[PDB]
Design a protein around this ligand. Structure first.
Ligand SMILES: *[C@@H]1O[C@H](CO)[C@@H](O[C@@H]2O[C@H](CO)[C@@H](O[C@@H]3O[C@H](CO[C@@H]4O[C@H](CO)[C@@H](O)[C@H](O[C@@H]5O[C@H](CO)[C@@H](O)[C@H](O)[C@@H]5O[C@@H]5O[C@H](CO)[C@@H](O)[C@H](O)[C@@H]5O)[C@@H]4O)[C@@H](O)[C@H](O)[C@@H]3O)[C@H](O)[C@H]2NC(C)=O)[C@H](O)[C@H]1NC(C)=O
Ligand SMILES: *[C@@H]1O[C@H](CO)[C@@H](O[C@@H]2O[C@H](CO)[C@@H](O[C@@H]3O[C@H](CO[C@@H]4O[C@H](CO)[C@@H](O)[C@H](O[C@@H]5O[C@H](CO)[C@@H](O)[C@H](O)[C@@H]5O[C@@H]5O[C@H](CO)[C@@H](O)[C@H](O)[C@@H]5O)[C@@H]4O)[C@@H](O)[C@H](O)[C@@H]3O)[C@H](O)[C@H]2NC(C)=O)[C@H](O)[C@H]1NC(C)=O
Ligand SMILES: *[C@@H]1O[C@H](CO)[C@@H](O[C@@H]2O[C@H](CO)[C@@H](O[C@@H]3O[C@H](CO[C@@H]4O[C@H](CO)[C@@H](O)[C@H](O[C@@H]5O[C@H](CO)[C@@H](O)[C@H](O)[C@@H]5O[C@@H]5O[C@H](CO)[C@@H](O)[C@H](O)[C@@H]5O)[C@@H]4O)[C@@H](O)[C@H](O)[C@@H]3O)[C@H](O)[C@H]2NC(C)=O)[C@H](O)[C@H]1NC(C)=O
Ligand SMILES: CC(=O)N[C@@H]1[C@@H](O)[C@H](O[C@@H]2O[C@H](CO)[C@H](O)[C@H](O[C@]3(C(=O)O)C[C@H](O)[C@@H](NC(C)=O)[C@H]([C@H](O)[C@H](O)CO)O3)[C@H]2O)[C@@H](CO)O[C@H]1O
Ligand SMILES: CC(=O)N[C@@H]1[C@@H](O)[C@H](O[C@@H]2O[C@H](CO)[C@H](O)[C@H](O[C@]3(C(=O)O)C[C@H](O)[C@@H](NC(C)=O)[C@H]([C@H](O)[C@H](O)CO)O3)[C@H]2O)[C@@H](CO)O[C@H]1O
Ligand SMILES: CC(=O)N[C@@H]1[C@@H](O)[C@H](O[C@@H]2O[C@H](CO)[C@H](O)[C@H](O[C@]3(C(=O)O)C[C@H](O)[C@@H](NC(C)=O)[C@H]([C@H](O)[C@H](O)CO)O3)[C@H]2O)[C@@H](CO)O[C@H]1O
Ligand SMILES: *[C@@H]1O[C@H](CO)[C@@H](O[C@@H]2O[C@H](CO)[C@@H](O)[C@H](O)[C@H]2NC(C)=O)[C@H](O)[C@H]1NC(C)=O
Ligand SMILES: *[C@@H]1O[C@H](CO)[C@@H](O[C@@H]2O[C@H](CO)[C@@H](O)[C@H](O)[C@H]2NC(C)=O)[C@H](O)[C@H]1NC(C)=O
Ligand SMILES: *[C@@H]1O[C@H](CO)[C@@H](O[C@@H]2O[C@H](CO)[C@@H](O)[C@H](O)[C@H]2NC(C)=O)[C@H](O)[C@H]1NC(C)=O
Ligand SMILES: *[C@@H]1O[C@H](CO)[C@@H](O)[C@H](O)[C@H]1NC(C)=O
Ligand SMILES: *[C@@H]1O[C@H](CO)[C@@H](O)[C@H](O)[C@H]1NC(C)=O
Ligand SMILES: *[C@@H]1O[C@H](CO)[C@@H](O)[C@H](O)[C@H]1NC(C)=O
Ligand SMILES: *[C@@H]1O[C@H](CO)[C@@H](O)[C@H](O)[C@H]1NC(C)=O
Ligand SMILES: *[C@@H]1O[C@H](CO)[C@@H](O)[C@H](O)[C@H]1NC(C)=O
Ligand SMILES: *[C@@H]1O[C@H](CO)[C@@H](O)[C@H](O)[C@H]1NC(C)=O
Ligand SMILES: *[C@@H]1O[C@H](CO)[C@@H](O)[C@H](O)[C@H]1NC(C)=O
Ligand SMILES: *[C@@H]1O[C@H](CO)[C@@H](O)[C@H](O)[C@H]1NC(C)=O
Ligand SMILES: *[C@@H]1O[C@H](CO)[C@@H](O)[C@H](O)[C@H]1NC(C)=O
Ligand SMILES: *[C@@H]1O[C@H](CO)[C@@H](O)[C@H](O)[C@H]1NC(C)=O
Ligand SMILES: *[C@@H]1O[C@H](CO)[C@@H](O)[C@H](O)[C@H]1NC(C)=O
Ligand SMILES: *[C@@H]1O[C@H](CO)[C@@H](O)[C@H](O)[C@H]1NC(C)=O
Lengths: 479, 479, 479
């Protein structure tokens, strides 16, 4: 008779893309994990103050709004919109200040305060009765006005600082506080990692009239003071400077960069745990990549891609007379048969184990390469707050597109590598079988060996374990 | 005798580049189409007003210059340079305003007007006798001056708006119109998709003196008014705001984004039609890509690349004793011979048809991939006007370089895939021939089969159409 | 007997990465050259003035500090820090001015002067006794003040120009020079390749008070004048304009772009020569790429990459019965044996020479492709000064990361191509040997040929040079 070695015939599950062709495979999966329909927040605390506080109220430490100063900060937080009024004075924010305040109120790090340094350098802060509820502000009102100074300080962390002015909308109060003429225009300048500036004038002159018109009015209608704020950026090891004159104001806190909380936009479900969450749902455990449109997430999360890709999970179907496949059912991926089905077909676990190990190792190497590329693209020392703030109002990140293209190319390369490794394993197994069999028989060049004798089911079964011997099968002659 | 199957010998036309090697091929073509030496403008209207109008005159709706308000806008348009004087007042434009006005005067979309809203909100516009020829402007001159306000409106389309001031160069007129003091400095601010601002002062104070010196004088030498203009951007669904004081001016029209006309720079030829045009010539019909240095074009145009690449159009020349080639001439790419030339060599159309179909399908898949990459690079909702305006004075687009590199890699991949598919077709044909022939004969391992009998001229022809039978050829024995 | 042809067995040196697998090779090297521990400055002059001059002193042509006006400019230069005082007036620089002055004081090109044009256009420059030591400045003080003008000039080279004001910190001097009121705010504007502006006011008004506080005091404590400077950029063929008023100042020199000197940061070693230097060490001669984190270098330097990669330098080890390897030692890479070691094994130099040439040619093509990609990424007409100035305070260049990724991919492709070419050479050699031998013998399909006769060592070496003939070996019969 004769024997053959090959793969187990299984239904074709799909098609994957290699470098030079498309291959039909018996099994495939997806590299990235898909978003769920809810947020699994078991074991996590949720902060919600949308009915009592606004974004600005948190920065100024209003009574009952102290998220940036909590000892333990919840990963999920919600609050009122940007235009929510406070109980103190009226406020105005620039566009840059709005963009950065959308983030800085919910940073999960530890914030640094430098109000005591200002107090000891320039004396006690100015006092007004309209800001009794708020606490976190320093008002520079020297005895001799305007009395310009430049305040320099070495920062303790990378972050943002809000500065500006606090002025009345009446001419008498403005003159009493600033000590300038109404027709004059003056500036407050900030020099840190970058440069920022803001201009002020009298209540009936530009641009202060526009500030008055555009300001957000407070809950108390008798309050005349408006606090106008801009933002500046500071680096950890460098020094920053602020040009101060009478009437200038500064919030004496550095809002350090890092992770910041996620505002839930979908249903929050308890009695369900996870480790990677986003504003629109959680992700399955142990994902190599996640299908997300941003880098903002909480918990332990992998890199994000914009779309999913298919990777091989089985083996190529290289079959339609022997054509490499084995009709008989076997418990494995490779087998030895003698055209007898039911008991004369035996499978070898060694080749299947090798193929599974090859798939695992190639996938691990691919994931490592992708992580290295992600680190190169975004940087080793990166923070989500800084990236999101620098993006600004833009919702499209080009680095995500570059990373997605790289991941697609990597997936194609992985499919190619896995297929080639499987081919090498099969060729090595065939060569080993030919070596073990003997030189007497001849090879048909397709994995089937014709023996000089008859090979019963026991002869086939002995070959798979490798204990086959030629002595007991020499009898009789056939071709 | 014996028979052989193989490819038709043809002269080598060139060399293409694959992933792992360079392959010699009998035919190749180019992916992209080349620019022509003229513009084919049959069936298209051409606008030319360079002898009577300038760029600014079109925006202000000067008598005889109304391109942005035409019902049907020609695809080709020419007009005077930016420094062309108008018949109204003198004008001054910022650098950003100049850059955006180079584009906005020839947008092919429909522009939105909001002058009636301004009139009903604030009353009739201010009137001067020096602007009788121009129509498209609103001059905010309230009864009580300065009377600052903030005008907010929800936009109807994404586009640009030109704002600023309209002031005299005499102190008396400036004081009468603005109602301010000459020593004061005031601002006009625009808040839309971004932020813009511009400053004004008295005629003898900075920066108004520089505006007077740098202004473009009008045709009438008795005109004292100067209109100073800056630009701002608005998004479709969002609201925009302008800070207005007495003396401020605004052009009450949103110049919507989209396609804009092309100014011809080469000879215009009628009696010749095309569908893709550029400023330096037209392009051939039905091109997958065009060799262009920008994304600005009119008509139906494909993506543009910076240089051309070669793609395979024939088959690889895998020949220098039989070496895979067939000496005898045949009407196809594949054939069967018996070392007899003239009638005993027969060609099979099936393999040639399969190879041509493979080339076509691979090229189509490549073009689809390139289109997807282009959409990812530039965005699904993109307009030529916005891209060109954001580019500014820069003439080098990095996205074009990235796309060209991607297209080069794609072309290499396509060559590899086509060559592999041709190899697979050839191997399948050889296996089918071996199966059809029979087990009696032996294979030399190079596509040539030695028969046990003689194969005459009719025997070769019988094999080609697949009706070959063994019964009538068993007679006689040879090796 | 029998003969075999194959590769010489050598110890495995390493593993390289190809497109679809990792290959074990007998030799590999690195694409890029590594930085040395010293600067080899034999035959080069070194400039050092850190004990007498500062950066600003060089621009103003202070007595003894004239690097930008030297006939021959040394490639290595050192000077005092930016905050070094001068012997003239006090100075203040904006952040942009500081960033550009860090570079422009050491440009190696020829600088263009236009002071004579200013003198002939507007008369003799204003004179003060506090600037007797400095020479390179023009002070615009007309007879009728303020007397605003706009100065337009066609540039001669691409570069930077420093402009601004020169004012006293006393009210009387400010009024006498400017001719303005103290409460007014005025601007100096620069229009070139981009737009720049700077604002001034009275000594007791913003922002001049901040300039006074932040200024760097001069060596002489009786000097009251402060020169406040900003920077602007000019292109070669275009015209630039400056808005000048009484009291404005401008440095009448265009600091042309190009290469600029390197400040040594490591030990300088003479009696040692090189052609590529950086601030932290030199590089070996004749390197295709250098491991550097920037594009700033002096001498003839190749493109820089951020990390090194391995390229093949030998051949793949395709061996563990004959398995393609030859046990006997030979003087080459390929050989012919008859299982007799010591004298019956002969090597062929043709295949080894072909393999070495293939390696060289593939590496050269790779280097050419990398150079083309570098030129596309950075531009054909580029200068180091412009790139470094546009980078600013950023120390991470993304184009370097893109180039490094491209070089990694290119190295993988080169390994693949070299291995494929070696395989082709081996297959061609085997086919030629089979053709030369004869049809009588049979092939075992593994590079070993069994002859019908015995083959002594003489029969073996006769094959190597190809003068083998069958006539003298027909005698005797064996299998
Ligand atoms: C303070 O800072 C916050 C954080 O920066 C700001 O949050 C952003 O607010 C935006 C305005 O509300 C918001 O934009 C909305 O996003 C919604 C997203 O939900 C969608 O769900 C769909 C399915 O139901 C998806 O189809 C859709 O888009 C997909 O996203 C996938 C990833 O999940 C991608 O793989 C897919 O390709 C697909 O398409 C992407 O869409 C992206 C835009 O969402 C786009 O950038 C990307 O290129 C792909 O094209 C999406 O998942 C939409 O339903 C809304 O219509 C609207 O677009 C941002 O998502 C918020 N960002 C984050 C990180 O939370 C907050 O606004 C700010 N506050 C203020 C006052 O400024
Ligand atoms: C209002 O907006 C308009 C649109 O934004 C502005 O139009 C631009 O005006 C510029 C100044 O007039 C103009 O620059 C000129 O371009 C000419 C182009 O013609 C050349 O023809 C040559 C053959 O005869 C080509 O060799 C040459 O360059 C090639 O272009 C090929 C594509 O066609 C490329 O594949 C090749 O690589 C090759 O090299 C490219 O050159 C590009 C620059 O042209 C460069 O960006 C690219 O990276 C490659 O290096 C070119 O085709 C030149 O002859 C002139 O010397 C000058 O460079 C722009 O082309 C105009 N742009 C468009 C889209 O029309 C208009 O200026 C503005 N008005 C104001 C007042 O600002
Ligand atoms: C006027 O202009 C000058 C030129 O623009 C400015 O010079 C810069 O000054 C900076 C501050 O002094 C200086 O930053 C320092 O750089 C040092 C570099 O020396 C290190 O040596 C180490 C080994 O001993 C390396 O490990 C290290 O980094 C490596 O660099 C390799 C290339 O040589 C890379 O292949 C490696 O990946 C590795 O990591 C890189 O680091 C880079 C930063 O150095 C980073 O950008 C890159 O992405 C890689 O991550 C480095 O070689 C450090 O020791 C110091 O700690 C500090 O970082 C800049 O290097 C100077 N730039 C140049 C071109 O000279 C000058 O500041 C300015 N003056 C003013 C007043 O502004
Ligand atoms: C009916 C009415 O509003 N009449 C006003 C009258 O209120 C106003 O007097 C000012 O009123 C405000 C009301 O909130 C404060 O009470 C002002 O007192 C203080 C304050 O505590 O806010 C005193 C404090 O010492 C001042 N601080 C500094 C640093 O100077 C501030 C400061 O002057 C102002 O807040 C300016 O921003 O004010 C009280 O003076 C008078 C103005 O004299 O005008 C009537 O029409
Ligand atoms: C010889 C000479 O020029 N003498 C001037 C004299 O012209 C000037 O009077 C002004 O002259 C201009 C000439 O174009 C206009 O006629 C001015 O009239 C108007 C106008 O432009 O129609 C009247 C109009 O009601 C005004 N509109 C508004 C909204 O206020 C404008 C406006 O005041 C000015 O255009 C300012 O921009 O002017 C006419 O007053 C006198 C100035 O009184 O000075 C002589 O030297
Ligand atoms: C003790 C003391 O400082 N008393 C000052 C007295 O110095 C000052 O007079 C000015 O002093 C400076 C000292 O460096 C110069 O000597 C001024 O002379 C000149 C100069 O040469 O610098 C004269 C020159 O013609 C002027 N140039 C122009 C273009 O106008 C300049 C110019 O006025 C100033 O430099 C302004 O920047 O000054 C000399 O006038 C007096 C002021 O009158 O004040 C005492 O308190
Ligand atoms: C996914 O990961 C989460 C971790 O966030 C798992 O939740 C933990 O499960 C272990 C084992 O049951 C418990 O001891 C922990 O108390 C759980 N954490 C919390 C916060 O409850 C979760 O089991 C994992 N598997 C899923 C969700 O299928
Ligand atoms: C290229 O495309 C243009 C379309 O712009 C073709 O011109 C049209 O040709 C058809 C068929 O002859 C006519 O019915 C149309 O009237 C033509 N259009 C116009 C505007 O005249 C042109 O024939 C195509 N082929 C070329 C140019 O070779
Ligand atoms: C590396 O290159 C340098 C050139 O910068 C070589 O130095 C020159 O060597 C030649 C030959 O000995 C001399 O004639 C020149 O005078 C040298 N130049 C200088 C400036 O001295 C150097 O020899 C090369 N090889 C090394 C450094 O190993
Ligand atoms: C292999 O052996 C079987 C029976 O022993 C025979 O039918 C078959 O033809 C043989 N294969 C070949 C290629 O001759
Ligand atoms: C492939 O296998 C999966 C099992 O994970 C199955 O859900 C899917 O339907 C299969 N696809 C086909 C085409 O049979
Ligand atoms: C405040 O903002 C919210 C959403 O940003 C908006 O719905 C609301 O109308 C705003 N309130 C006012 C008074 O404009
Ligand atoms: C305001 O200006 C006048 C002169 O214009 C001046 O006398 C007065 O001192 C100025 N006001 C202050 C507070 O200095
Ligand atoms: C094939 O047959 C021809 C003649 O029938 C003969 O000359 C040739 O040697 C044969 N091929 C081989 C490999 O023996
Ligand atoms: C290749 O074929 C084209 C036909 O389109 C011909 O123009 C060209 O000259 C040929 N090239 C060579 C090298 O024969
Ligand atoms: C107007 O501009 C054109 C081209 O931009 C130029 O040739 C002409 O000299 C300019 N006219 C004036 C008066 O500057
Ligand atoms: C100009 O300023 C003076 C005082 O400096 C003031 O009295 C006058 O009202 C101002 N002009 C206007 C139009 O308000
Ligand atoms: C080749 O010849 C040797 C001796 O001549 C013999 O031992 C060996 O078995 C032969 N090879 C084959 C495949 O028969
Ligand atoms: C590879 O060869 C180099 C010789 O250039 C040698 O220095 C190195 O140690 C070798 N590596 C191994 C693993 O033998
Ligand atoms: C000047 O700068 C150097 C380094 O930039 C610094 O060490 C020194 O303290 C500075 N001098 C002063 C007076 O600030
Ligand atoms: C300063 O302003 C006053 C009026 O405010 C004016 O009379 C005087 O001429 C101005 N100074 C100058 C130098 O013009």
């Amino acid at each position: 008779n004769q024997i053959c070695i090959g793969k187990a015939i299984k239904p074709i599950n799909g098609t994957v893309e290699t470098v030079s062709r498309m291959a039909k495979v018996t099994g495939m999966k997806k590299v990235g994990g898909e978003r769920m329909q809810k947020i699994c927040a078991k074991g996590e605390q949720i902060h919600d103050s949308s009915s009592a506080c606004g974004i600005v109220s948190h920065h100024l430490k209003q009574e009952g709004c102290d998220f940036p100063f909590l000892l333990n900060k919840p990963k999920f937080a919600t609050t009122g919109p940007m235009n929510t009024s406070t109980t103190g004075f009226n406020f105005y924010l620039t566009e840059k200040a709005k963009s950065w305040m959308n983030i800085t109120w919910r940073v999960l790090g530890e914030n640094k305060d430098f109000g005591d340094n200002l107090v000891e350098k320039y004396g006690e802060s100015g006092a007004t009765s309209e800001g009794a509820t708020l606490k976190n502000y320093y008002w520079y009102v020297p005895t001799a006005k305007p009395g310009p100074v430049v305040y320099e300080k070495l920062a303790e962390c990378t972050g943002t600082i809000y500065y500006g002015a606090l002025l009345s909308d009446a001419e008498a109060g403005y003159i009493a506080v600033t000590g300038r003429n109404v027709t004059e225009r003056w500036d407050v300048r900030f020099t840190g990692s970058s440069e920022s500036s803001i201009s002020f004038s009298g209540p009936k002159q530009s641009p202060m009239e526009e500030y008055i018109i555009k300001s957000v009015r407070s809950s108390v209608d008798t309050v005349r003071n408006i606090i106008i704020l801009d933002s500046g950026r500071v680096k950890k090891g460098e020094t920053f400077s602020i040009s101060l004159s009478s009437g200038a104001v500064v919030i004496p806190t550095i809002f350090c960069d890092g992770d910041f909380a996620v505002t839930p936009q979908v249903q929050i479900d308890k009695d369900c745990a996870s480790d990677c969450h986003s504003a629109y749902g959680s992700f399955p455990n142990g994902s190599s990549f996640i299908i997300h449109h941003s880098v903002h997430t909480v918990g332990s999360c992998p890199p994000s891609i914009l779309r999913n890709f298919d990777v091989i999970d089985g083996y190529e179907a290289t079959w339609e007379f022997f054509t490499g496949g084995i009709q008989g059912a076997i418990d494995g991926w490779y087998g030895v048969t003698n055209h007898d089905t039911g008991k004369g077909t035996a499978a070898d676990q060694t080749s299947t184990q090798k193929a599974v190990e090859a798939i695992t190792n190639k996938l691990n190497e691919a994931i490592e390469n992708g992580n290295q590329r992600y680190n190169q693209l975004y940087g080793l020392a990166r923070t989500q707050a800084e990236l999101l703030g620098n993006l600004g109002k833009e919702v499209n990140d080009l680095r995500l597109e570059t990373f997605t293209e790289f991941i697609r190319l990597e997936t194609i390369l992985v499919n190619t590598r896995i297929i080639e490794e499987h081919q090498a394993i099969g060729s090595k197994k065939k060569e080993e079988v030919k070596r073990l069999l003997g030189p007497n028989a001849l090879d048909l060049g397709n994995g089937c060996f014709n023996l000089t004798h008859t090979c019963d089911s026991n002869c086939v079964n002995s070959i798979s374990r490798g204990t086959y011997t030629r002595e007991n099968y020499i009898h009789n002659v056939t071709l």
